[PDB]
């Protein structure tokens, strides 16, 4: 009875929030689309264009960590993620749909009761997990590489 | 359930001297910080260099980049400040410069892959056998960290 991918992410992240659910989905989609790691020394590098909870799902499931210099953050307030296996020619790019981010913002108000705020947290997670893939993000496989600094 | 070392190595993806540094800093911080004072108190960590070591801190001290709880101020220094939010204290750990110097002597640009991996194992064990006094200096100081 191993921990599930979800349980591993939440254990590491330390709470359940809509933004970690977004990262769980991006991580799993990247796992699916990137294909088979081509060599033992090939590393998954990721460039994220915003720093948020989501990064932690990427660290746990894609194994691209801050400590390895494999997770690269360029803060531009964009929910866009570029994934690359080293030695390959390709970037797997995922951009979360703007409508998704818009809706999640509505669930955070400064003047909520703690009960109300927590209800909206759980609603946001339902929302993220029930989106169809095409509604959730846009995927482009493009020529490109990432490298460590 | 995995051991703390298993958890760190599995997350980090290899066993290197720098992860061993981080592991020891993380367990010393877990010891010296004391009991988390409230369910809403968070461990924030400010690190003065980005290296493998940070992964141990993320896993064991729970201070992750996704949570904005791990804060990197890149100054090429193996110094770490730990803070439970709501408290008055910073727990500061500085890895001994002699330790870093010795680890640097184990890296050479044109090693064989075999020689290099031998030196990796030597360096890991070197970190793990250090006495605490030899490994780092600890200061508990008045101060706070907050998320940016
Ligand atoms: Zn979160
Ligand atoms: Zn390492």
The experimental method behind these coordinates is X-ray
Domain count, chain A: 1
Tell me the H-state helices in chain B.
4-12, 17-33, 54-60, 97-105, 113-129, 132-135
Question: Which chain A residues are Cβ-neighbours of B19 within 8 angstroms?
Answer: 67
SS3 B2: coil
B9 alpha carbon – ligand 2 mean position (Å): 9
> Are A35 and A84 contacting, i.e. CB atoms less than 8 angstroms apart?
no
DSSP string, B48-85: SS-STTHHHHHHHT---TTTT-EEE--SS--EEEEEET
Q: Which of B13, B94, B5, B99 is nearest to B46 (CA)?
A: B94
Question: Which chain A residues are Cβ-neighbours of B68 within 8 angstroms?
Answer: 51
- Assign residue B90 the CATH number of its domain: 3.30.1330.130
Question: Which chain A residues are Cβ-neighbours of B11 within 8 angstroms?
Answer: 12, 59-60, 63, 65
Q: Do B51 and A63 touch (CB under 8 A)?
A: no
User: Which of B50, B53, B67 minimises the CB distance to A53?
Assistant: B67
Domain of residue A58 covers 1-149
Task: Give dist(CA B16, CA A83) in Å, integer.
Answer: 25
| Structural tokens at position A46 | 């990721």
Task: Give dist(CA B51, CA A68) in Å, integer.
Answer: 7
Closest ligand by atom to A10 CA: 1
> Are B51 and B80 contacting, i.e. CB atoms less than 8 angstroms apart?
no
Closest ligand by atom to B65 CA: 1
Resolution of the coordinates, Å? 1.5
B20 alpha carbon – ligand 2 mean position (Å): 8
Q: Do B52 and A67 touch (CB under 8 A)?
A: yes
C-alpha angle B91/B97/B98, rounded to 5°? 130
Task: Give dist(CA B90, CA B98) in Å, integer.
Answer: 24
| Structural tokens at position B76 | 């090429």
> Are A30 and A60 contacting, i.e. CB atoms less than 8 angstroms apart?
no
């Amino acid at each position: 009875v191993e921990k599930t991918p979800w349980e591993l992410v939440i254990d590491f992240h330390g709470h359940t929030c809509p933004d970690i659910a977004l990262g769980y989905r991006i991580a799993q989609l990247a796992q699916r689309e990137m294909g088979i790691r081509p060599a033992p020394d090939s590393e998954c590098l990721v460039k994220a264009y915003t720093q948020s909870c989501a990064l932690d799902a990427i660290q746990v499931l894609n194994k691209a960590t801050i400590g390895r210099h494999a997770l690269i953050i360029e803060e531009t307030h964009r929910y866009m993620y570029q994934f690359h296996f080293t030695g390959t020619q390709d970037i797997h790019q995922f951009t979360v749909s703007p409508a998704v981010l818009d809706h999640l913002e509505t669930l955070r108000h400064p003047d909520l009761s703690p009960r109300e705020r927590q209800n909206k947290v759980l609603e946001g997670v339902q929302y993220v997990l029930t989106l169809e893939e095409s509604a959730f993000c846009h995927y482009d496989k493009i020529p490109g590489q990432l490298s460590k600094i």
